[PDB]
């Protein structure tokens, strides 16, 4: 028996959607301290209320109390010693002080601005760690520093001339370019040295900043529509499409000297004694960089172009020399560099799948001595699972004369590994990406981390010793997925957590127990920062399940059961898909904020299936690697298998009436489904589809698919715009949605698809969101999308 | 009493129908005619007739000729053979009758050939000789020098060049374009018609050869001169339009004067160069008005037209103010231009040397409270020696509100002027008294003077040949009248057809391209014969065919023209495609096809089956197709088209509906519950207006490339009809359909939007902004784009797709 949905009018559907729409603190900082043990600073937006700086006070004892959000006036930089906060707001840079001297505020303060003699925006501000009088920023693609006390400002780099013709001005300093931001999750191009040196002479403080210089001259340009549509203009962007040139890159060191008063006596640009391209010829990208805590060595994390070969490399300051046009000066400087100064490759990761860039690298101070370096490192390529390892490298300098031009041989600068011991292991992951981090207590010799040990459906907080690794203690309660911040003193932590059934809350927990057994400290709930909002009456949590493919692989999925289900009757079904790498849709956390519309579907009597197929993350490199060089192929197989399983198990699925719908990669796969499984999928709604892989960027596309010339078959197979002949020659089976200003998945993708559909004589329906980028931010756009989708389903799913 | 239902077909079904209709049509016309008399009493041919045409077994246009016989058999039809001259393709050519030189662009280059003159006539195809250049990039807008055909002109990188075709010498004359990398830093051109001039003023050149040489310099140097427009687009707004190579994801920068914003800074200037007896270029000189153009002519926004008197005595220009309600025809003598120089001391010397009795002369002035349409007819007669007057023919519309021929005599009045002093003109500065102004034509009908229409004047016989709507607004015909003895107008073309005529320079023969709603076009040559002492009544006789009319397909059923009177008692014409295989007592679904805007007339007695085949296709599937020329449309006088002044949107739909209601009442097979409105451009605008303002009339609208917001359209067009936005906020708001999305239907499947992505007349912005507002007001829409298309859908698969989509949309959603 066939369940049909009530057909409603357009305004009826608007009423439903408008009605549904009626239905968090972050960037936490614990600070030691009356009856208050600590103050917790954070960002938040209360009920009624833009986002602002807030704090809350933790008592020494609490009753065997929901913490009040106190006001202080998207990110902020903080100096624990001085209590200096620095933050952007209202198109300027502001600062305030709390803690340290003058104790703690008991009432809101006015934020003191830092005005300038600078033209245009001041981006990517950071305080100088060694000396909080100073801070840094980028201005017209160059690095500046300034003094908050004196008001002095100094430009350090001279890459960007600021010429009239923008295409004739390719060089930047301190800047993360497009692919680095979008595909490598790095938003800065410079790094404060944490210490001052006193190089000699008058003994003036020298401060140092490592920075990436880039030259985008050879990189391809594209034009994207400006947001102010009425101007009918575009902006130019350097977009390295797969197979094209990435930027020319190079690490440099800026230094400047300061007196006792804090006045800037001098500055200088330094560069590597040989070119970066000479020393590191097979590096395509700088993934990450930083410094050892002592400032003895700068370090960088390098990637080759295929993203199969990563290196952590130390660069000492002595390896940089004054930049100069004078050839005679250059050679003199190169000659003056000690022979025992050199780069040291302290680690190398290699794989035949790909290098996922993990953020975890913790270099220990050289308590041992100057002859070696110990560090913690997240490594995935060893076991195919991301785990913590304690590595020790040997730093013995081979003689080098840097005045000579020099060609690196095989394994140049490679350090012997004295020790390499795995602190974690097993068929589960330490989470080391996209904000996940470790916290290391050198007093107790313990590493805190998050992982999927208990289950891939839940993030939990664990603890292990890095001296003599053994028992792994979990600190978080099962039946929830947890996102944790640790106090700097390792006494308390925050968990933002939820489950599929319970909306999110934010709790502070206390680590209590005998100090002589720190590994087995007990977590005890202390206070709440936010209790869970009430689940709306018209909200029914989805049900997580799992099943085993014909190839004997465990896949997880969800079902939103049709509300007011009756037995016997089969309901029309929406397969909601993403299906691409770096994502996991199915886990035990609350879906009602981001995916409310799926519940709305189910309330009208659509069944909603979600399947995390092979390619999805939190399941190890082998699982995700299944789609290597053949995107589209594996993924659809698993979507079908999961749909068929759910029909068999749950019984209320009408397989004659299935819609496939996703965004981005999900839009791509929606089209693959209709192309390759027309008898499964009656309709497709493809959001912002990738239709041609040749038109996507280097960083992402090449990682997973190689360059086009090396994988013609895979590119062609997985480029849905090339397979338009196989799309249905029946109307009302294909709806395309795309934001016009999208600068990730260019509108080009949809435009070229439509172009090919016209050439193939195929029917299509189309909706554009003229004011939207990739993600639909504006609420009217969202409502319109949702109403369009409900209408489409009610009309064209029988 | 009962409703007809259209057969619902599958998508593939509809594709079969559309693909079939394109083949089964089975419907190439030669053009740009030049008669030349043969100077051989022995041979059998009176003339050779040169033209452009796509011959048999050939896919490109080329230069062709036909031999015109001295005698023809009376009731035998001679079909003339198209001979080739040469061993897409060629779109135009310049021709010098005396020397027999042809000049034309082809294969990304310049070519030339000769036939006639002293050389005599080819009996077989000849190879076209290329003209080599050292110039980078294209050589545009070439023209032969009238005074000396050894020279020709062209534009290269927005500057004026001349060359010698014999010697091969080339010399640049203007130095406006610096050739910088950034185009925004390099905004000046010479010889070039800018966007609004081309698109909205129908002008595609910015330079004009002086027709005569002069001999200043006792060394025996000959001087040759070119009038040209110099422009500066610095202050003009830039917009970006997507490049046609989509895969590059880039745009082109364009200077787009949007209504209200800055048009280019303009000026007329004079380039001269001197030649020796060998034909070498001895010297060149950029000259400019003795005072600035902006000083002399401060109210001039646009140069519509320009040229020279036949003797080269005066350059002339047709000027327009920004409102386009004030036009002046202005004579400019070469002596008013001085050498350009940065040296201010040298400039003053030159200014001091300019005689006091050298000045401009405003020989005609046209003023209206509607708008000035630019008519191309202005013919100055030669002056007697030492005469201070100029006689000329002029087409004037604003006087009676109908475009007619006048013979004007103006008196060239010297006020006497000190050109060293900075100049400020008063009212009526340079204004020339009008001694005489005879009406050669009159009545409630038009002499056609636009969009290719022209006159031909025979100074021997004192006769002026012209085209008009005298007989009917539904047909263009060829007429003749005397400009001496104004009186009887003789018609020269056959009634029951609309005609487009080309006249021989010797007034002995002419060509007519003509057709009717029922008959496809033909091209026939006619001979004007009779006693020479009665030239007004020369008889046109069919002589030969250039192209016979194709057989009207069996599948094709001509529409029927009709007319009616509005409630205000205004006569509107319309046409009706009756549903094929009509059965009585059935009421059929109906498609209102609309354009509705100025400068167009949809309804006239000419063949619609080429351009509007799909309207017949609609009728074959059982839709009635209605077309109404309401008020606003052309060929009915300035008053009729002026109806929509400052209120576009308002009057037009009322007339469309009144006509629809008339057609239902008269014909009886119209189902008023099932009417769709469909149009492109202005028609797209109106399709949306219809749905907004008459939702009870129009069940669905299909809006092609709609104008949705008038603030986003250009100066030339928008301001002519609506003023600038600041002066007409009410009109702009009322007629901008994207500002009335709240009034669009909140029921799906009543609105389909179509737009080419590369359209650079109606920017895609229009559709984007509409969609934006529809989203904001929670309205449903369907959308189709054509990524590779500009305004007109050229590529055939795009067109088929459009047609199939339209049929599907109608068959699915045109119900009650
Ligand atoms: P779609 O799946 C991408 C939608 S836009 C987007 C959103 C987030 C990110 C960050 C990924 C992590 C960086 C290391 C990139 C792009 O298109 C993919 C083909
Ligand atoms: P649409 O009708 C724009 C069509 S593109 C075009 C075609 C012809 C001309 C010359 C004369 C203008 C009246 C047809 C210009 C532009 O209308 C948008 C306003
Ligand atoms: Cl005369």
Describe this structure in words.
Chain A: Keywords: Acetylation, Aminopeptidase, Cytoplasm, Disease variant, Hydrolase, Nucleus, Protease, Serine protease. Chain A: GO terms for molecular function: aminopeptidase activity; dipeptidyl-peptidase activity; identical protein binding; serine-type peptidase activity. Chain A: InterPro entries: AB_hydrolase_fold, Dpp_8/9_N, Peptidase_S9_cat, Peptidase_S9B_N, Serine_Prot_S9B/DPPIV. Chain A: Val-boroPro binds at residue 664. The structure is a homodimer. Chain A has 798 residues and is α+β, with helices and mostly antiparallel strands. Among the domains of chain A are: 26-115, no CATH class; 438-498 and 502-537; 541-796, Alpha/Beta hydrolase fold, catalytic domain (Rossmann fold, 3-Layer(aba) Sandwich). Chain A is 15% helix and 33% strand. In chain A, the strands form ten sheets. The first copy, chain A, has an eight-stranded mixed beta sheet with strand order 37-38-40-39-41-42-43-44, sandwiched between helices. In chain A, strands 13, 14, 15, 18, 19 and 23 form a six-stranded antiparallel beta sheet that branches. In chain A, helix 8 links the parallel strand 41 (653-663) and strand 42 (683-687). The radius of gyration of chain A is 28 Å and the shape is globular. Chains A and B meet through helix 1, strand 16, helix 11, strand 44 and helix 12 of A and helix 1, strand 17, helix 11, strand 45 and helix 12 of B. The complex binds ethoxy-[2-(4-pentylphenyl)sulfanylethyl]phosphinous acid (2 copies) and chloride ion. Chloride ion (CL) binds next to loops of chain B.
